[PDB]
């Protein structure tokens, strides 16, 4: 769908960092880390939502685990975004996805380091769970299952 | 496979809904005054006058031309150079008849059973294409134009104009939007800019902000004030008919349309009344889920309390047997006219606002809101 | 699937349609008198205040207001007790009068490289279901509030009088009419006949004559005049605005359209012109056959002789790719606008016969002419 | 289809009074007949146009006849009884709306006969004409059913 | 698809050792690195086979000497690999569970990277239509990792 | 589309599968010192007897006895308490030979075109859910029932004894494999063991390396010897014959099947060959590409050298239309039996070896090599 | 499409038919002195030995070589010619006998409580192609060897000899019968008569009267004993066993099948209960015309009297959604054995008759009953 109701060409982007196994250390590293972004709200450029959660098998057998993650409206396509990036990089955060607002979907971009771009493009599709299967990589803000969607 | 797929929407500077605008303020007045009333007023814009006329039925007292220039002074048309002006124009007004005698005799059969007003057909049309179930083009449109206007009324352009047109192209492949073909903008503007400035500025404060980046290529086109100039706007441009631009307020095209103009009439009147009422219906239903977009067509004869037609369309969208689903529909809402009026009670002097940039596509507006689609949610089980 | 559709076609009798057919004649006349001229007037009705007015860039010289008489006389609407009287109507004329030829003597510049008037969008719709290339239900209404205007002109029911409207429900199975659910008629009346006799009457000479027998059965349901009370009408009834029945001149609102009325536009406008254009392309794509039902989006911005966007719809009754189709049509088609002036050679004062009772649907009319298909059709290929 | 135009509660059928046996005195007897009916506008009830001519190929061709009757079946009954004295039974009705109407075999003074499944009928679709051409005004036409 | 001919639970991962663009001193290092592994298989737990060739198309694919090592312990022994990645700098490896051939890759530095990818869609197929993605082919069979469409 | 699937199997313990262990070992023996031979035996397994009969033609000689007991004794009933002994337990050989004369007297004929022995009709499958192209169910479940035998040979769970028998039931979405819902194991077990470490036993040393966790869910459930008693196990509490779990040998019961027991059949009989034919071509079939999951059956009249139904079966899931399908299968394969002969090289005695744990899905069975797919796939052009 | 499929029945002249009707005959008239019994026996047939056993829990008091003698008389294998006779064969009644448990614990608490009597797995099809809701080809072919049967008992071609084979290979466009290609009709016949005179009257008084004149094309091929020479058949020729033919009983090959082989097994047996169990619901949702053809896979943990798995499959065909129809088969019909013993009065003496000629397909039987299938047409209205 084209979510119009929501703002124009902003990137909303999402962020976990609670990366190892470390159960409450972890989710006190999260709050950190939420509290860090929110210091420096223009060079993040960004507005912060902590409320998302995100939801995984993750490949290691022992269970799909979950962490507690923020969405964050960045302005610049790039600028805020590649200030998010380098977060998650001092953060040993491997990848975040950004979709663009207006078209309510855009890739990931596994990119860390300094000055690396690595801008996927998934199926054009995010959000979007009519809570008929839960399968896929794992969302839910507002207890509303939003995860993106791929074409068939 | 691709193909294009246009749509416009004019501002609220333009002379036809200027118009609309006027009916619309005056029927927010009198039914301000009164609930009960039943009015069906017209507007005619003409370059140097204004004219209302029609009929209202109620007792109020109501000012017609202040209403007229306290409108046109939201809108700004304040100076000669614009060719139109609030205080100097020339207010016409033979709506009168004010005879409220006739329905305040005798009340007593229940208002559900009342007929309906007069004879007509109309459509509620919905869709999942975006958050608000509207057509995305038509809501681009609409962001557009009032865009401008707020442009213009905030001063950041200051030499802007009220009266402007916006119309858009999109390619529509496997119904998803790839991007815009091509953007056409057309402004009233004042006679100090020059041509470059105005389409360098117009695309910066106008199309950029409010277009997604991604649908905004190279390959899309973009015209703007071909001509450029229109330092004559609104009026002395052009003939102002109430409800002429019918079809801007509905969908833009993007689905069928029954035929009798929004504005200027009262939830009295089937047209809007019923409009309103399936689109409503249509909303809860794609909120519903049961169809990705829905079309819905209901007839009235003249004093039929009930639809002499009621027919639900889905496209194929349907999740379900369509059948059951015209049940739901005659179940799940009661279509007398009065009725869906206490499904709705438009009685509230609201129309001010849905005068222009799209009827349908903001929230505020009653018929909007789609509670009765989790109802709908339980009456119908899984999808196939 | 079955389910239910309904339309709606107008009398001449109606306000709308008599503001409509008033400005067509004035534009027909001007036409006559002047081809090149530019044309936008429109009509108002007030109770017995008629009001014209545009801008008219003609070198032509003629009396709206005799005009207009003359015509709402044809209509007949000659006594004030009827609602309206053609020799008392209140002509209230603002005009807009300007020199085209001094504008011509400007541009010096090739007609099809001349822009379009204004901005704007509109359809073309047509389908193999009637023979004359329309759809069913708008066609049938039509003949429908036509056969009662004749009736009355010609006096078989004298009392009758001219204001009628008709509203027509059939129900559609799997896309095909099994039967007409419900026939609605209004229509004004003398005082003296009872409501009763006119419904018999109507149903007699209006009803059966119009409508197959076999849609008509029990269960379809006929209200006639339920108010019953249809001497008050005409412009006193209600006020009449021009254009404001645009769909039920259209399509009946079987399929879109774009919002710009057909009346008080010559063919130099887009809106008239191109409405025009895509009837006549869909028309003649039919006759070849290339699809069932088909319907056209062809957009115009201000200026520009490009026609901004072309869209062609099958509903999956397409036989050849969509695409294919669309590049025959821009091969077959030139969609400027003084490119379908000549395809069509519309630059002749007719448009008073497409004042009422259907502007899709007569063949006397240029555009529902079909040349083009058989040649499209050998454009086409396989089938 | 629905052809839109003549009168709709009217009825158009159509009728060979050519038999197999011969042809051109069957063409005799035919223009005979059929100018019979023709200048009897009253029981016949109806406006005759000869132009139409069939075939079935069952292409057994005949000159045939289009008589127009408002009569639901009255000056139908006067066509169909006439189609017995010619010893004739092939006949074929349709109402202008429906464009189509199965076919009547009706000889006999009340013998009277219905046809099942009728789709449609007078029009080529210029795919397979296997099916009884009906040739008139330089156009092919025949009757159909759904499929 | 489940291959289910190979050892069940078993865990099987890759590794590279080539990040850096060092290519022949890059070749010795990988394979002293491959030394360091499998003279200690205890630690690592695992079955070492360095044939194969891992090529990243990263939008003009890059091709480096790969190995690929069967893990036992569920996370363990593939812990060790991913530590052994970490200090040979190799960014991420790929890991999965044979039987069914389908897991993301972990990212791992630090003390423990503990970084898998979500949309774990599959692994080990050849289409043998369209290479435009990561070519990690052993024995000329181009094993690419895939997701459901 | 979510639906649970369900397999069984059986050790090469149970008594059915006995009775096959014991028919093609005879087979093997025969095949051995004659391969021209034609043998058609059967073998009844009573609680303390077992019968052995069968029609024979050959110049063999060959002990039904010694062989019996051997293959008995292999499987490991070699005590009274385990409810059957290889020493003690009565042979019985009913069988009746056939003069190899009539064989070597019938000459000047093609040895392809001699029609086929006798009519009969089968089903071979594949899938390339599996690389071995087998329904993925049933392969796990030989593989566990093998496991389980395993464990008892290499003395690990000695107190294990051989009957036991397995079922799985597998979640299924979208047709493709989730989880597994259910497990039920049960065996015959020395009377020392308890119930209780039985369970964990039989959970540890079978279930666990077995079956990818993954699939493993707490939600999946357990059952092992449900009844909680089987020490009396083999042919003592229950009978047993020859080809009565046609099923458990060729599909877990995925797909559709022909109804000729293969054990105790020589290759010159119709049914095994023409089985084993079916499923190499279509594996062949699925290898090459030609299409995803393809189900053969073949039929053959008495007397008769060319089939009378070659009929495929692509679930939609073909990759080229059906009927060039059929023709390039006419074309490359010969299904005459002596042709199919020819072409899988059957005249080796091999079949002790596929006694038990599925007839397909093991490599070194010729029917298992997928040489001729190569050729397939370039017969058709095709790009994918 | 085009596609040619095959299937084969066998006379009850054949071996394996006729191993299966003594087993079964033994059970009736058990089961008619005890229905609580409970019998699982297994019949081999040799030369001229018929060897019986099993394992029988009962109080009954039953000669095995009586029904033997008698049920091979009824057959009509009477003379040495045939190559066999019940006055000459040896009857070998292995069957031991138990007590039943008189136990307070196998009384009242619950039957439905009661756990499954054996792991396993079974099928259930139906079709909507025929009025007996089976597939075509194993219809005719029944049909035929019964014509068969009843040709050679009215006296018509007295020189027929009991045992006898046909096979039906129908064309098959768009999976409707459109011809039968192929006929394969292999019979007993008396020494006396001739093969040609042979072929002629069979294919009269036998092929013309059982298969639709119009499949028979003149490209119609035909094969009748074409070996040329039937005399010595029965058991003499080769070993016939208890329910190996299960295809044939079945659903002729068009259906996947489980693998418990119904003859000779009590009802409590989960095997055949379930599986008339899955026929009988496979009819059920037919008949409510809810799919055209479904398949039903039920599986059963032993001692667990809920079943373990349970699989609906409708090819697509489903009227309604497969999932709501599942919970539909779980509501509707109790699964558990004593469930479905209760629900089919499986518990009466009956199947003698059903031990040859089609398991399903004959109304009177129990299972077959299309009584519940108005219920399951009630319990869901939507069309698509």
Redesign the interface.
Known sequence: ??????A??FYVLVSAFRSNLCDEVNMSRHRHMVSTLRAAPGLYGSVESTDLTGCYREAISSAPTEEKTVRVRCKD?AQALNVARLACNEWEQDCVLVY?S??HT?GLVYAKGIDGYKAERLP?SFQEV?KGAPLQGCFTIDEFGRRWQVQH | ????????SVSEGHPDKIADQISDAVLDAILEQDPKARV?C?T?V??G?V?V???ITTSAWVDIEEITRNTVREIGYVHSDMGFDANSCAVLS?IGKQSPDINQGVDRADPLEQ?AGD???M?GYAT?????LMP?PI?YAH?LVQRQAEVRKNGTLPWLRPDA?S?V?FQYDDG??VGI??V?L?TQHSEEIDQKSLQEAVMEEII????????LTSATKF?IN??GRFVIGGPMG??G????????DTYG???????G?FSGKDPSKVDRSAAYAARYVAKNIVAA?LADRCEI?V?Y????AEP??????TFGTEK?????LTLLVREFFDLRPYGLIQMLDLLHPIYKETAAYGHFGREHFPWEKTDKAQLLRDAA????
């Not at chain 1, 769908?1 to 929501?6: D, H, V």
């Not at chain 2, 004869?301 to 039929?304: D, F, L, Q, R, S």
């Not at chain 2, 089980?381 to 196939?384: F, I, R, V």
């Open positions: 769908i084209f979510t119009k109701e929501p124009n060409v396509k663009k207006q078209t855009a054009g009519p | 496979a691709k193909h294009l797929f246009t749509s416009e069906a017209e005619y003409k370059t006058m004219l006329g029609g009929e033979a007929g004879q007509g057909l459509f999942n294409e975006t958050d608000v995305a809501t962001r047109k119309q192209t998803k939007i073909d091509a056409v057309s950029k902000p409010i277009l997604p980046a991604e649908w015209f071909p001509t052009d003939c008919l109430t409800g002429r631009k019918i079809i801007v095209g993007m689905a069928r349309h029954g035929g103009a889920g067509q007839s004869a003249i004093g039929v002499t037609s009621i027919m639900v369309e379900v047997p369509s059948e059951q089980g899984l999808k196939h």
